[PDB]
Amino acid sequence: TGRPEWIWLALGTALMGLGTLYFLVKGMGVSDPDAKKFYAITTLVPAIAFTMYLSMLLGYGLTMVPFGGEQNPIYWARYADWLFTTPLLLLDLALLVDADQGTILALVGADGIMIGTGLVGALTKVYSYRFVWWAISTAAMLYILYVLFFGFTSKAESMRPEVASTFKVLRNVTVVLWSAYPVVWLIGSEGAGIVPLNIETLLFMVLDVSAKVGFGLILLRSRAIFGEAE
Amino acid sequence: TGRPEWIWLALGTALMGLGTLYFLVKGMGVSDPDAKKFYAITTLVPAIAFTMYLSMLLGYGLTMVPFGGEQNPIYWARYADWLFTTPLLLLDLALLVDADQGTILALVGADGIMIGTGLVGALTKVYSYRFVWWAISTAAMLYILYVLFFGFTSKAESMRPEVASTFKVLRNVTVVLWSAYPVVWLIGSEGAGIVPLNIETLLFMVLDVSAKVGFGLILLRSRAIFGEAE
Amino acid sequence: TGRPEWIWLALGTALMGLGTLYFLVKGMGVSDPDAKKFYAITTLVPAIAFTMYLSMLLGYGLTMVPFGGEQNPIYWARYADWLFTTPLLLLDLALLVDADQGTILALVGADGIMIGTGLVGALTKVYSYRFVWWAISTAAMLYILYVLFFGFTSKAESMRPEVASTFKVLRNVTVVLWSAYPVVWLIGSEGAGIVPLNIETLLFMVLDVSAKVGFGLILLRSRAIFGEAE
Ligand SMILES: CC(C)CCC[C@@H](C)CCC[C@@H](C)CCC[C@@H](C)CCO[C@@H](CO)COCC[C@@H](C)CCC[C@H](C)CCC[C@@H](C)CCCC(C)C
Ligand SMILES: CC(C)CCC[C@@H](C)CCC[C@@H](C)CCC[C@@H](C)CCO[C@@H](CO)COCC[C@@H](C)CCC[C@H](C)CCC[C@@H](C)CCCC(C)C
Ligand SMILES: CC(C)CCC[C@@H](C)CCC[C@@H](C)CCC[C@@H](C)CCO[C@@H](CO)COCC[C@@H](C)CCC[C@H](C)CCC[C@@H](C)CCCC(C)C
Ligand SMILES: CC(C)CCC[C@@H](C)CCC[C@H](C)CCC[C@@H](C)CCO[C@@H](CO)COCC[C@H](C)CCC[C@@H](C)CCC[C@@H](C)CCCC(C)C
Ligand SMILES: CC(C)CCC[C@@H](C)CCC[C@H](C)CCC[C@@H](C)CCO[C@@H](CO)COCC[C@H](C)CCC[C@@H](C)CCC[C@@H](C)CCCC(C)C
Ligand SMILES: CC(C)CCC[C@@H](C)CCC[C@H](C)CCC[C@@H](C)CCO[C@@H](CO)COCC[C@H](C)CCC[C@@H](C)CCC[C@@H](C)CCCC(C)C
Ligand SMILES: *C/C=C(C)/C=C/C=C(C)/C=C/C1=C(C)CCCC1(C)C
Ligand SMILES: *C/C=C(C)/C=C/C=C(C)/C=C/C1=C(C)CCCC1(C)C
Ligand SMILES: *C/C=C(C)/C=C/C=C(C)/C=C/C1=C(C)CCCC1(C)C
């Protein structure tokens, strides 16, 4: 309770934990192989986030980085979360549209570059260089957003309407929520330091629960996750 | 030789190295694609363990963690081993039964959570919180054990008898040996400290060689690893 | 500019960045799923290397390792690069020949052992033991080279001539360039220290740009990356 942001770390831990349990129960019983892949992906995402929220809450996932002459509290565990959960979210989208394997590779690899350069920026001790990593990471994010909108152009032919509809909704959820993360980091504790860590943590908690549990609720309620069967 | 547990680290290095060489030789010549996947998986497992045993033996894979007011010797290299070798062992089981891809994802991701939360527990400086990570990791292990027993329920129909027989044996080997690891950690150097590090290292060496080389000997001697062919 | 090797780190950053941009543009428009996988793999390789070259240039990817009684500058970011880019290069080769999945596993796992034991050697504080890790890593490299020459022996039957021709060329490029890396490390800053870090960095920059951008130019100009189509 000693860090003011504890309350949002606690709330994020609880909501990710409850979302995980909900999705775990919800997928109990499903047999359809296509649906099993979406439940597995979609349940792992908040499970991983639960563990990394808890590590921040307990202090394990926090480190001090000197930059600006100051000792700056940097929650590194966010990058260990996102390293796994953001490619998993992209895989859910990619599987929905039956993406080609080359496209999945491009997406997962650009996402790794996005998170790994964000982690390098988050831990860089020369203040000005932190924003160079932010820019490179943002370029990788823009590439991902580009592929999500313009990289499935051969798939439209042979896409079930309900898959098309659930994919468009989740793609729009993804583009809006993910695009807010570079802005929060830029103005927050890792970047310019104009928004305090307390509020930054709240913002990422709202984004994360929305991008993982809210995304997952929309996907897992959809018929698009089942193969078409008589 | 300065740490009493060196002898078990040396013995573990040698047995993993010899098991690797044996499996490498044994799979020389196999053409069958199914069998090649099992030899590859099963040979990589003790090869990786050989390197991490050697890193503990040479001291690289040891760190001191303050907790309990004391400086506690924690062999972190075990988690770098298990991060790769325990999903590989699960993949051998999963391939045997032709598991659905969603099930393999669930298994590999729960296993990553199990090892990563065990690593966080192993390095946590607040003593009481180490057991919170142990509990979460144990929950993930129990999920894996649950899936190995109740998650292949559609596969029984179309399973060759020899695959069914080798899978049941290896599944039983896996459930018994893996379940001992949380107990050893709980009573050993990472947990309550009731069993000294010397004996703990012996216990994990016996478990590891059994779970990797003993498992691999049972699998690789089986006809279940070959596709059925005239 | 304070470290004499900065100029090769700068040149390597620029050439990897320009190679990435070139391959990104070059693959704009390709529809063929086979070709998309090769463009994705082959574009990610210099993109990742660009980020790790930049991290060395900016100092983030450098650490000091005590060994020999001295504080030795070790660029660890090379291992974070190679951890991802060397399996990706192997995947390009493997996909060219339609390798069996067991063979791809063997290659990617031996490559992980090669890079992870090279990283352990690079950070080991007992000088003599650094060469033990070098030897193990070299054994893994020799295994990979062995598989590239003798592990596709069932694939020769059903291999298009242009795939066979591009694969032989890239395989020869790979064996020659990769084999130089253990020699550079052995005589350079990480090993015996007979070649200064400045020259070592130049050597790895020439190898890396050749093994990634030069390799990629040969592959991506080939018809072998397209499925055979009327
Ligand atoms: C899915 C859910 C039930 C998760 C609920 C949210 C939760 C994890 C975080 C909320 C913290 C909350 C209790 C706030 C008040 C603090 C308080 C207790 C007293 C203050 O008092 C103080 C004074 O400084 C702090 O106490 C010590 C530390 C604790 C407060 C933190 C404990 C860790 C957690 C509560 C989480 C435990 C994880 C488990 C789910 C493990 C089981 C795994 C498995 C079976 C799948
Ligand atoms: C597959 C096998 C042959 C492995 C055999 C077991 C072994 C790796 C560990 C046993 C240690 C043992 C010799 C005990 C006595 C110590 C002693 C030498 C003297 C004591 O004297 C002392 C005094 O404190 C310590 O010596 C210095 C360190 C060494 C003892 C340790 C050296 C490392 C290893 C012996 C392993 C080397 C790895 C290789 C396989 C590399 C090749 C890779 C490739 C070709 C695939
Ligand atoms: C693809 C290319 C355009 C890459 C070009 C090469 C380059 C990255 C490295 C060359 C350094 C060079 C300018 C040498 C002179 C130094 C100098 C400026 C003055 C010396 O003056 C000094 C005194 O000590 C140092 O300056 C401070 C640091 C900088 C010199 C380094 C800045 C980082 C880089 C220049 C790279 C930026 C990365 C971007 C591509 C981000 C955008 C991502 C996205 C849109 C895809
Ligand atoms: C968020 C992101 C930036 C992260 C992206 C990925 C990331 C984790 C990068 C990792 C690269 C690298 C380790 C960097 C080190 C930095 C540093 C300063 C020191 C680190 O930290 C230290 C300091 O004490 C220890 O590291 C050395 C040991 C290793 C970390 C573990 C060794 C592993 C092996 C030798 C075993 C072989 C593994 C394989 C077989 C894997 C293949 C799987 C297969 C079987 C299919
Ligand atoms: C046992 C477990 C807990 C481990 C589970 C996974 C694990 C390794 C978690 C890693 C997350 C994270 C790095 C945590 C950092 C903690 C910390 C305090 C600081 C670390 O350690 C430090 C301290 O000096 C350095 O880290 C920063 C640099 C990075 C480690 C490496 C950067 C990688 C990239 C920028 C390149 C892009 C990579 C991708 C392209 C990968 C995608 C593959 C593709 C091409 C298909
Ligand atoms: C170049 C090579 C040697 C590297 C090869 C791989 C490598 C990165 C090895 C990593 C092992 C290990 C982390 C070693 C730690 C060393 C040390 C001294 C301390 C480190 O560094 C520290 C010091 O502060 C922090 O580490 C602990 C936290 C973790 C690093 C991150 C935890 C991750 C999780 C708990 C979440 C679960 C992840 C999974 C779900 C992944 C599965 C994917 C799925 C969903 C499909
Ligand atoms: C589950 C959490 C999700 C969906 C997180 C998304 C994170 C991002 C899109 C992060 C992007 C970043 C940048 C583009 C620039 C650097 C800072 C980051 C890593 C916050
Ligand atoms: C090759 C080595 C094998 C099979 C290792 C298995 C390791 C485990 C099943 C570890 C489990 C753990 C817990 C469930 C709780 C926390 C402590 C661990 C990581 C030892
Ligand atoms: C893109 C960069 C490439 C192709 C790098 C290749 C790196 C190697 C083949 C590294 C090999 C090493 C050894 C065999 C011994 C230990 C030192 C290393 C890691 C340099």
mmCIF file of N, CA, C and O in Angstrom, chain C residues 11 27 43 47 58 99 149 166 189 198 221 227:
data_model
loop_
_atom_site.group_PDB
_atom_site.id
_atom_site.type_symbol
_atom_site.label_atom_id
_atom_site.label_comp_id
_atom_site.label_asym_id
_atom_site.label_seq_id
_atom_site.Cartn_x
_atom_site.Cartn_y
_atom_site.Cartn_z
ATOM 1 N N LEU C 11 27.850 1.670 -38.809
ATOM 2 C CA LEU C 11 27.721 1.114 -40.165
ATOM 3 C C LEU C 11 26.812 -0.118 -40.143
ATOM 4 O O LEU C 11 25.992 -0.255 -41.049
ATOM 5 N N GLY C 27 8.957 -7.016 -50.776
ATOM 6 C CA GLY C 27 7.875 -7.969 -50.624
ATOM 7 C C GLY C 27 6.503 -7.336 -50.645
ATOM 8 O O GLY C 27 5.537 -8.106 -50.485
ATOM 9 N N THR C 43 12.825 -10.668 -43.870
ATOM 10 C CA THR C 43 12.789 -9.254 -43.511
ATOM 11 C C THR C 43 12.967 -9.082 -42.007
ATOM 12 O O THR C 43 13.601 -8.147 -41.522
ATOM 13 N N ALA C 47 15.767 -6.794 -39.448
ATOM 14 C CA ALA C 47 15.066 -5.825 -38.594
ATOM 15 C C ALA C 47 15.500 -6.014 -37.161
ATOM 16 O O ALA C 47 15.775 -5.064 -36.406
ATOM 17 N N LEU C 58 24.368 2.505 -28.981
ATOM 18 C CA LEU C 58 23.983 3.425 -27.909
ATOM 19 C C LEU C 58 24.498 3.010 -26.540
ATOM 20 O O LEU C 58 24.371 3.786 -25.551
ATOM 21 N N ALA C 99 11.729 -29.329 -45.339
ATOM 22 C CA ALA C 99 12.199 -30.247 -44.318
ATOM 23 C C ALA C 99 11.046 -30.785 -43.465
ATOM 24 O O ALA C 99 10.065 -30.084 -43.198
ATOM 25 N N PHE C 149 23.928 -30.514 -44.289
ATOM 26 C CA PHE C 149 24.462 -31.253 -45.448
ATOM 27 C C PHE C 149 23.958 -32.681 -45.574
ATOM 28 O O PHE C 149 23.919 -33.237 -46.681
ATOM 29 N N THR C 166 19.085 -22.917 -55.341
ATOM 30 C CA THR C 166 19.148 -21.812 -54.368
ATOM 31 C C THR C 166 19.496 -22.333 -52.974
ATOM 32 O O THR C 166 20.248 -21.706 -52.221
ATOM 33 N N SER C 189 37.627 -10.375 -28.137
ATOM 34 C CA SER C 189 37.402 -9.800 -26.834
ATOM 35 C C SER C 189 36.760 -10.743 -25.826
ATOM 36 O O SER C 189 36.833 -10.523 -24.610
ATOM 37 N N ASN C 198 37.895 -3.462 -31.337
ATOM 38 C CA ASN C 198 37.609 -2.662 -32.517
ATOM 39 C C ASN C 198 37.556 -3.537 -33.768
ATOM 40 O O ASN C 198 36.578 -3.511 -34.519
ATOM 41 N N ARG C 221 15.721 -13.066 -54.433
ATOM 42 C CA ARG C 221 15.763 -12.834 -55.874
ATOM 43 C C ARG C 221 15.495 -14.110 -56.654
ATOM 44 O O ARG C 221 15.417 -14.070 -57.881
ATOM 45 N N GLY C 227 5.656 -20.937 -54.894
ATOM 46 C CA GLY C 227 5.131 -22.246 -55.282
ATOM 47 C C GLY C 227 5.107 -22.377 -56.798
ATOM 48 O O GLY C 227 5.030 -21.395 -57.546
#
